[PDB]
Design an enzyme around this catalytic site. Structure first.
Site, PDB file in Angstrom:
ATOM      1  N   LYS A  69       0.817  -1.242   0.000  1.00 40.54           N
ATOM      2  CA  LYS A  69       0.000   0.000   0.000  1.00 40.54           C
ATOM      3  C   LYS A  69       0.857   1.302   0.000  1.00 40.54           C
ATOM      4  O   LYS A  69       0.580   2.233  -0.758  1.00 40.54           O
ATOM      5  CB  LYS A  69      -1.048   0.009   1.144  1.00 40.54           C
ATOM      6  CG  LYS A  69      -2.226  -1.015   1.004  1.00 40.54           C
ATOM      7  CD  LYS A  69      -2.903  -1.172   2.343  1.00 40.54           C
ATOM      8  CE  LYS A  69      -4.337  -1.515   2.237  1.00 40.54           C
ATOM      9  NZ  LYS A  69      -4.518  -2.973   1.960  1.00 40.54           N
ATOM     10  N   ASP A 105      -9.661   2.785   2.672  1.00 39.50           N
ATOM     11  CA  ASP A 105      -9.511   2.171   4.033  1.00 39.50           C
ATOM     12  C   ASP A 105     -10.036   3.016   5.163  1.00 39.50           C
ATOM     13  O   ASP A 105     -10.630   2.506   6.102  1.00 39.50           O
ATOM     14  CB  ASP A 105      -8.030   1.924   4.337  1.00 39.50           C
ATOM     15  CG  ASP A 105      -7.485   0.712   3.654  1.00 39.50           C
ATOM     16  OD1 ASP A 105      -8.257   0.002   2.984  1.00 39.50           O
ATOM     17  OD2 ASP A 105      -6.268   0.464   3.775  1.00 39.50           O
TER      18      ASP A 105
END
Length: 260
Positions: A69, A105
Site C-alpha cells: 500500500k 480504508d
C-alpha cells in the site's frame, strides 16, 4: 461487450475475497457500466514494480493489499482524495493515461463501526489510514509498534507513538499488523489482556477466521469485530471508482454483502 481487467495486488494474495465481491458487481452492473469487468488476484513478487505490472497487464483498475500500500502511493502519477493524507493507496485507476491512487480504508473502517481514544497496533499502510481517520474524528490516538517505522508520519498526524506499551486504557484496540495473517498475536498475551479488560472494542482488520487477537478478546468477554465489514465497505468504495463514479458505493455494498 468491451472488456476491462482489474485485479488485486498482494503477497500473499490467494486468501483474498476481493475477486468474489468485485466480480459479483461487475456482472450485476454491466448494463449501466456498458462494459464487463473481470477481476483477478495477482501474486506480486516483492521485487516487482506495481505501476509497471499494472501497465503491463493492461489493467483499468486495481486494488492494493499487504504489503504494497505505501509503495502504491510512491509510484502513482497522481494521488486523489484522503490518500494524500494517508501515505498509502489501496485503489488504483487508469485515468486518461495516468495511474491514479485512492485510499478507501479510512472510510471503509469508519463505516464499519456502529469511542474517545484508540490504540492502533501496526505501522504499515493500513495503520496509517486508520490513524488518519481516527484523528479526523477527534479521537485521541496512540500507535504501538516494534520499531521506529513510519514514526515521522504518525507524529506529523499528531498521534502518540509508542514502542513500549502505554499504561493506559483505550476504548478501541485495533490490530493493523500482519500478525493474524500468520496466525500469531500482535502483542504479548498479558499486555493485551490488560487492554482488553479496559477496552470497549477489540477490532482486527484480518477477516474470516477467529484470529489469536480476536480469540483472546472473546475468551475475556470483550466485544470484538473482524475486518469483514471493513472489507465489504472498502470494496464497495473501490468499485464506485472502478465504475468511474456511476455506481454509488451503497449499491455495490448491498450486492457485495449478499454475495459474501
Amino acid at each position: 461487450m468491451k472488456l476491462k481487467s482489474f485485479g488485486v495486488f498482494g503477497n500473499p494474495i490467494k486468501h483474498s475475497k476481493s475477486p468474489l465481491i468485485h466480480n459479483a458487481c461487475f456482472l450485476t452492473f454491466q448494463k449501466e457500466l456498458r462494459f464487463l469487468g473481470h477481476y483477478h488476484p495477482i501474486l506480486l513478487p516483492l521485487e516487482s514494480h506495481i505501476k509497471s505490472e499494472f501497465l503491463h497487464l493492461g489493467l483499468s483498475g486495481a486494488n492494493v493489499t499487504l504489503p504494497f500500500k505505501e509503495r502504491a502511493f510512491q509510484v502513482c502519477d497522481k494521488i486523489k482524495g484522503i490518500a494524500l493524507e494517508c501515505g498509502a493507496v489501496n485503489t488504483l485507476v487508469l485515468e486518461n493515461d495516468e495511474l491514479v491512487g485512492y485510499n478507501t480504508d479510512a472510510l471503509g473502517f469508519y463505516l464499519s463501526l456502529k469511542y474517545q481514544n484508540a490504540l492502533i497496533l501496526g505501522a504499515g499502510g493500513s495503520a496509517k489510514a486508520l490513524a488518519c481517520e481516527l484523528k479526523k474524528q477527534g479521537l485521541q490516538v496512540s500507535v504501538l509498534n516494534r520499531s521506529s517505522r513510519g514514526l515521522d508520519f504518525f507524529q506529523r498526524l499528531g498521534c502518540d507513538c509508542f514502542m513500549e506499551p502505554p499504561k493506559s486504557a483505550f476504548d478501541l484496540i485495533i490490530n493493523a499488523t500482519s500478525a493474524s495473517l500468520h496466525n500469531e498475536l500482535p502483542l504479548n498475551k498479558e499486555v493485551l489482556k490488560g487492554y482488553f479488560k479496559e477496552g470497549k472494542l477489540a477490532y482486527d482488520l484480518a477477516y474470516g477466521f477467529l484470529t489469536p487477537f480476536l480469540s483472546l478478546a472473546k475468551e475475556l468477554k470483550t466485544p470484538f469485530q473482524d475486518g469483514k465489514d471493513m472489507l465489504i465497505y472498502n470494496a464497495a468504495l473501490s468499485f464506485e471508482k472502478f465504475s468511474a463514479s456511476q455506481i454509488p458505493y451503497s449499491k455495490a455494498f448491498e450486492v457485495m454483502r449478499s454475495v459474501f
